Design a protein around this ligand. Structure first.
Ligand code: HEM
Ligand SMILES: c1ccc(-c2cnc[nH]2)cc1
Length: 338
């Protein structure tokens, strides 16, 4: 790991302290592409305005509140992890679980999930075709309708809403939900594929994991950061990082992945020591920290369990399995067993 160097048009950051710092300072390192680049919603939103948007759904992902789904999840997990044998664990499980838990928490039927996950998948760079233009269309439409429908799920909560001295825009409302869809349908799928990996490579940590199904997850998030790095950050004013002068505008590429391996922070980082006493910037840190953090921690845990209690041993047929090849995120595209 070295000092942030400027190349290809942006400084890269691989040290927990500098990363943790680049994020913690959002007034200086605007999480917003002031100019234009083209995730949406309040994730590319800034300091003062940011909070106003994040507020709306904000109370719905609080530990106490998400756990108010504790059963439904394990409910869903069971049916999924029931057969799903010899089958692609990713497609048929890791995908199905969060694509469900979120669809419901939001208002998305069991009929739109195929479309939607299929949608996001394009957004987060995991499949590209000309066929995308009418998925975006073929979906926003489906979304546009759900706002009408009813319930009291996030979407309805977003529907008749607004805040401050303005009424939230419809497109603003759409993008808002698109933010939670790209958060729920994705990234969670990998923290599951990465715990399994941990098992293929470290065969006898099982019995401890069971005992501490949480610290285990919590660890996987440090060892195999689902999201390898955040690319969209830019200098809003001239500042430093170590002994580097960032020019106002300068793109700031903060590599989370590495930061979780920083040696100056984690004793024998490289190992899977469970229970370490330091937080991992996997879910980031700051005003922009993952609002879905509490959500995944559970889904992770429940499944971790559902999994282990369903498979004697755990080998990963690699002649069939392949890790997505998108350097920004770490996870399996296909993972098969035995
Ligand atoms: C398991 C994989 C997950 C990882 C590793 C992950 C990681 C992160 C990180 C690091 C950020 C902040 C990026 C930044 O600073 O700009 C973020 C933001 C966010 N994540 Fe995730 N996430 C995960 C799961 C979820 C889930 C399930 C949801 C649920 C819908 C979700 C919704 C969001 C939202 C809405 C934000 C942005 C909040 C804001 O703008 O401040 N995430 N996530
Ligand atoms: C674009 C927008 C949001 C996300 C995301 C963050 N946390 C989970 N998903 C990933 C790409």
């Amino acid at each position: 790991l070295n000092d942030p160097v400027h190349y290809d048009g942006a400084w890269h950051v691989y040290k927990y302290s500098d990363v943790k710092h680049v994020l913690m300072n959002d007034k200086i390192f605007s999480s917003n592409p002031g100019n234009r680049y083209s995730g949406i919603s309040f994730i590319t939103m800034d300091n003062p305005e940011h909070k106003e948007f994040r507020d709306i759904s904000a109370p719905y992902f609080l530990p106490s509140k998400i756990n108010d789904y504790k059963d439904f999840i394990e409910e869903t997990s069971n049916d999924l992890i029931k057969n799903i044998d010899n089958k692609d664990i990713i497609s048929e499980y890791a995908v199905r679980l969060p694509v469900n838990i979120i669809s419901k928490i939001l208002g998305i039927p069991d009929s739109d999930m195929p479309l939607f996950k299929l949608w996001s998948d394009y957004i987060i760079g995991n499949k590209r075709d000309e066929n995308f233009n009418y998925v975006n269309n073929r979906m926003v439409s489906r979304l546009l309708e759900i706002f009408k429908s009813d319930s009291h799920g996030i979407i309805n909560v977003l529907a008749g809403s607004s805040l401050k001295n303005r009424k939230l825009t419809m497109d603003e409302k759409i993008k808002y939900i698109m933010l939670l869809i790209i958060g729920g349908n994705e990234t969670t799928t990998n923290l599951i594929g990465n715990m399994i990996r941990v098992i293929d490579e470290n065969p006898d940590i099982i019995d401890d994991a069971l005992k501490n199904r949480s610290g285990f997850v919590e660890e996987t998030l440090r060892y195999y950061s689902p999201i390898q790095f955040l690319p969209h950050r830019f200098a809003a004013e001239d500042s430093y990082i170590n002994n580097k002068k960032i020019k106002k505008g300068d793109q700031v590429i903060v590599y989370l992945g590495s930061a979780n391996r920083d040696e100056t922070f984690f004793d024998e980082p490289d190992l899977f020591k469970i229970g370490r006493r330091e937080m991992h910037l996997a879910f980031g840190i700051g005003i922009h920290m993952c609002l879905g953090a509490p959500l995944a921690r559970l889904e992770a845990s429940i499944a971790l369990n559902d999994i282990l209690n369903h498979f004697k041993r755990i080998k990963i047929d690699y002649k069939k399995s392949r890790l997505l090849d998108n350097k920004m995120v770490l996870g399996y595209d296909k993972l098969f067993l035995s």
